Symmetry: C3
Subunit: 570 residues, 3 copies
């Protein structure tokens, strides 16, 4: 009756597996014989889900319930979903087996501490699951009264004492992402525990989640409710992974464990969530974040049942948080910004198209289009001034198809290919585009009212060497120069175009290297392209190359070691 | 890229299609240390909504109507709840993760021009699910392809089914209901519940719970005026006591456990029990109605081939049925519902004389029973109306009153003996005590008072048991309906000393010629009469009886010569 | 053919009857290559309606009433959904076909005249089903007997059950609820759910889901004025906290897999848990109410006999109960609901003095608790009202407040010591636990003078008399009191009028002690007192502690000479 806690009020959880005195046999028992299998079960809903309160003058029913639901699992919300448990036992040949069902409870206590003693204690019994006790008997056998009758409340498991006092370089493009961070997420302090089943040796026990009530309780958290609301997050989840049902589920999950004939074991079942993150990656940093926990199909932990008589170590409840019991996962799916216009090119591009920029008024927007046949396309704008960025709709072309026309599959899940989200950067994209697939070109937010054009042209030449890379157009006076762009991910490409400052057939001393990033560069001179070198590593290279004056050269760089968000070139 | 002629086609790419990006949106289970994880779902409301991808050459109506004309009608099938389950066990001290998906049947509407697909419409009908499992460790880096699918694929092997868009019965006259077997299905997967791909070391089950009891029987007839659907159901009730046609309460379920070295697939179908109602008249079938009562399903279990094999473009089979159950043919004669059933309430003891009432020339039945088991000779006045005796199948197993007929209202009858004819005959038959028997009086052509007589045979006439005796002119060939094999037919004639040769045609029968002295004495034994050339000395002006046991039945009719 | 006397009889031909021509009208399943086929059904609504075949002397009402009077009441039974299941596996590279049937219980109403059955009525009550399986090949010719049944038959062995149609309890006085065991059934198959015939190598299951939660308890009493059904249910709630009568949520299911060598039959029953409410007074049972709370079922597994053996005509057994569960007897005393419960809110520390009020002369309880564990001597003025201490079973396991009584409303009590015999001088020496709640039943007094209950903590030599009641004794000799149970204690206090004193008892075996008087000093030890002839100051107080070892009589008698 002595504690080490400071003076005050505490919320105490004595754990699951509590059975109550004298209510041992009041649910009924089964008799089986000669190899028969006896299965006894129940469903926890309505009357058998009502907690039993034992209030005290200082701690009333509301004072108990509110504190218990604030720190531990919310039983009021949990008791509205029917949960089933089953126990299976087989009788040996030429023998009689008797088994009777009980109910197990989670014992919560509200205690008052004064001068290192418990002067007051409240009790709450929340129904969780059941317990089957079996025996083998013979006619006229005298069974011990302890098998039938319980005098005082006991924990079939080992009791616990949980108290609380009452008072990475991402090489992403700018835009939205939905990340599947894994499955099997649970909450601390047994906030998701369905229940514990103690299975005796040689018997079977199952915890069943039928869909008697097709209802779930998703958990949501955001850093900016103005932009990333719950409805906004659900719409983006539907855009990314086509999630339809959030607060309703029809899937059934069930865990069954058979105990070995030599030891007793217990199983714990939990409710799981599938973690989703909606981020707004801008200029190399996360600006917005919203965590969405879609309810998953449960997690079962199977452990050997410890001795009911064991040392009780009084423990403080862990801080509120999540634990992942499923495997590691990170699926990144870019989604279309819902606050931007989607323009379309209905007739598929064959060899030459010249899109006219409309109704947009300098706002950034998408251009949904497709090509007539697979090939390498150079996509540029007037004087290359607005730097475009090409995307691909994930899973486009697998369905309805019409030859020579765009089929708007209405897929907002996009995959970045190449392009810079930089103002005032001359560039054109050299990309390989597939037939019948839908592609997006995000035109950046311009500041000019002059009519602009997007041009598409098939590369039936040496320019196919620059496939899936964006070429920077360069300014030069010799001396020291630096150019900073977003570093492409590992194994991706970035191209540079520059001229040596009078064409005479006159060389120059030109040094080529990068900063903080390793890439096996390649050099082409011009339009026909011929290779000058193969394996220029440009991390901090001091190499020098004879460069003809007044000639155009191209620097393809394949990023191998991504150390910085930005790539710098000299 | 196609071999089909120019036009529009309906294409089925088969079941087992999974859609991109929606792999993990239903949830996943984590299990550890010997636990069993079971994950399932039920397809009824939102799990059964097809997804249409129309083109500006076809339509959602154009897709649905063409799909449902040739392949399974999903609209009427998606309204019946179907359950599927997947079971997996984790090994000791190890963590197992599994996540549920949905499988679809990919239907396509394609347009062909100059041997190429210029337009393609897509329909995804939901069928079943698919559970994908892995074993992981804390900090294990799992391949993204396990979690995420980029493009739609078939977990099974894809298919390409296209269609261009533009015996001697020795029966008596009367009605029959024939159970022709169970496990009947329809071609082109018109009854396929779904396919489950079970990975090695896991279990998968397809469940048909009776959440909705509606069933859809199929019926076809050759004469809707006579053999309507309601008429066929009434005759089925008469024959086999079938009560529930559109409703079923029985639950069926197929479970298969995959071996640890093979991943295998199971196909579940809806089955029908074939019934035929026929009107056999004068040796030929005049009417026929086919009724397919919905049965309790059929499961086909086969090893799953590689999802990547040669796709051979195939034409859909013609409309029809396949029997996957065992061979069956149960023939149960039924009482004609368009004929009167008269009754003899007091059981026949030794002598009865029924008076024909009212029934003036329509055929009718006489339901009756005997006081004790014995051989009864049943005739009519001058034997002119040839009667036919039947037996009610399963009469006397129930309510009983001594010395009185107890009506059982059993319309299932079993033919014993008698002719469908204007032919002098009397029946010698053994009748059981409590059983109910029918005597079909034929359609007469006179207004005179006729009588049916029953007399117990305690003499030598008991040798002709379960046979009808023809009374014989002869001052020669006689044609009657041939009794079935091992059955009997009797002939009675008078000799006008002489040379007598008796033989049959197209049928082999064991003659057992007796002489009438009324007393019967056996004169010749085992006279095989199939084109026999034997002869017997026959006394002039004496009555003789020839019992014939049909051994070889080649013709509907039995012929006999003098 | 009959041996019965002339008259009318009710006949049960048992379960397992299948009807002619209705064989594969429910459908059949085809499985192949290691598949498992499971076929089941649920007995309710239409497949639950009996089929009557009346006779001129026995109509439908006559048949139904006579069947339900003697055998199982099917009308009440058919309203509760019961499920059955059959499981079969097909071997590799083979085709298995199975079709479902319905089984019935054949009841007959027969009339006997001159040793013969002149009239017979038939009733077919629905029960569970029957699955028949076969292994077939393409083009295999199957026997018509497998598909088609011509006449009704019993898949089990038929039966012919006919009926002609025309101990020292050492308890204290008070109420008890006794759990007499589980698995109780009724004779003549009045609780039989049904029988499943499982073919070799297949599985069969009888399922009791809760689609209807209604259950049907059976109740019998000897005095409906006092022990009504509601009174019995309230006492069951007091004793074992039984909350749901005539309603259950628990699901029970029996599954049996038949060996590949034998056919197996399983019988499922509805079970009851027997409860007895008794009024034990002055050594005899005065009232008794028997309550049979419906339990989870009982399954009997036996090898299927040949459906063809001698059908020995049998008379139905007398109505009664059979226990198929283990032996049990749990005795729980309950608080008398017709008596007042007073309370002492402040826990007793060392000294309390309750003043007896509202109670008049009626007997009543005093609910109280002590501050700390110790041996308390509880008396009442001049020891005239003999008190009896009880303990509330399961008190102190829950809400707690230091220094105050926490009422738990537990009416389940455990007798400790005290005499239910007024006009007897006594005080109780008992050890009381700290947080436990205790009852003191004050007997029905006859005086109007205010009396008092005194509690005093014993820190002296009086602790030797723990858990015993001391009789205060005339003696200028035999004394009769209720004999304590075996291993319990009873104490006697007397004054000597030195002298020769003989100590012995009658009909009871007891180890005695002779503590001399306040300080107590041991004088005699291990005095075996049944008819003992042993013998031993003058004008001194002695105490006789007696430990009952052999209980032959309800009363203990002690002689002093």
């Amino acid at each position: 009756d002595t504690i080490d806690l400071a003076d005050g009020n505490y919320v105490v959880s004595r754990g699951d597996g509590w059975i109550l005195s004298r209510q041992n046999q009041i649910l009924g028992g089964s008799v089986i014989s000669n190899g028969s299998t006896g299965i006894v079960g129940d469903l926890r809903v309505n009357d058998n889900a009502i907690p039993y309160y034992y209030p005290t003058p200082s701690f009333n029913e509301e004072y108990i319930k509110n504190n218990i639901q604030t720190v531990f699992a919310n039983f009021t919300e949990a008791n509205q979903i029917p949960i089933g448990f089953e126990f299976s036992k087989t009788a040996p040949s030429n023998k009689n087996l008797y088994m009777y069902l009980q109910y197990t409870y989670i014992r919560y206590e509200i205690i008052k501490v004064l001068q290192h003693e418990i002067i007051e204690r409240a009790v709450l019994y929340v129904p969780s699951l059941g317990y089957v006790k079996s025996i083998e008997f013979n006619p006229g056998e005298k069974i011990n009264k302890d098998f039938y009758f319980l005098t005082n409340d006991k924990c079939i498991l080992n009791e616990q004492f949980l108290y609380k006092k009452i008072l990475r370089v991402l090489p992403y493009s700018n835009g939205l992402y939905v990340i599947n961070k894994g499955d099997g997420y649970i909450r601390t302090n047994d906030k998701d525990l369905i229940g514990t089943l103690l299975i005796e040796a040689g018997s079977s026990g199952s915890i069943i989640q039928p869909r008697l009530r097709n209802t779930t309780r998703p958990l949501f958290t955001t850093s900016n409710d103005a932009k990333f609301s719950q409805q906004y997050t659900e719409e983006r989840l539907k855009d990314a992974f086509n999630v339809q049902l959030f607060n309703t589920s029809t899937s059934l999950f069930k865990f069954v464990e058979e105990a070995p004939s030599n030891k007793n074991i217990c199983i714990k079942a939990y409710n799981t969530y599938e973690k989703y993150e909606l981020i707004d990656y801008q200029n190399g940093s996360i600006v917005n974040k919203a965590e969405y926990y879609l309810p998953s199909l449960g997690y079962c932990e199977v452990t050997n049942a410890p001795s009911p008589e064991s040392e009780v170590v009084k423990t403080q409840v862990a801080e509120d948080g999540f634990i992942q019991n499923g495997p590691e996962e990170e699926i990144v799916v870019g989604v279309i910004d819902p606050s931007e216009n989607i323009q379309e090119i209905n007739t598929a591009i064959s060899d030459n198209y010249t899109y006219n920029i409309p109704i947009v008024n300098n706002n950034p927007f998408y251009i949904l289009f497709t090509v007539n046949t697979t090939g390498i396309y150079k996509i540029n704008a007037q004087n290359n001034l607005p730097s475009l960025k090409i995307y691909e709709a994930i899973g486009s072309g697998n369905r309805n198809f019409q030859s020579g026309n765009l089929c708007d599959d209405d897929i907002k899940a996009i995959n970045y290919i190449t392009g810079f989200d930089s103002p005032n950067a001359k560039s054109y994209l050299v990309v390989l585009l597939n037939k019948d697939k839908n592609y997006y070109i995000r035109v950046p937010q311009t500041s000019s009212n002059i009519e602009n054009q997007i041009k598409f042209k098939r590369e039936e030449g040496d320019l196919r060497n620059l496939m899936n890379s964006s070429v920077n157009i360069i300014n030069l006076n010799t001396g020291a120069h630096y150019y900073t762009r977003q570093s492409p991910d590992v194994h991706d490409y970035i191209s540079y175009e520059f001229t040596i400052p009078n064409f005479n057939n006159d060389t120059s001393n030109i040094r080529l290297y990068t900063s903080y990033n390793q890439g096996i560069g390649t050099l082409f001179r011009v339009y026909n392209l011929i290779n000058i070198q193969q394996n220029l590593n440009l991390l901090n290279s001091t190499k020098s190359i004879r460069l003809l004056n007044g000639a155009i050269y191209i620097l393809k760089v394949e990023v191998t070691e991504l150390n910085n968000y930005n790539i710098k070139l000299h």
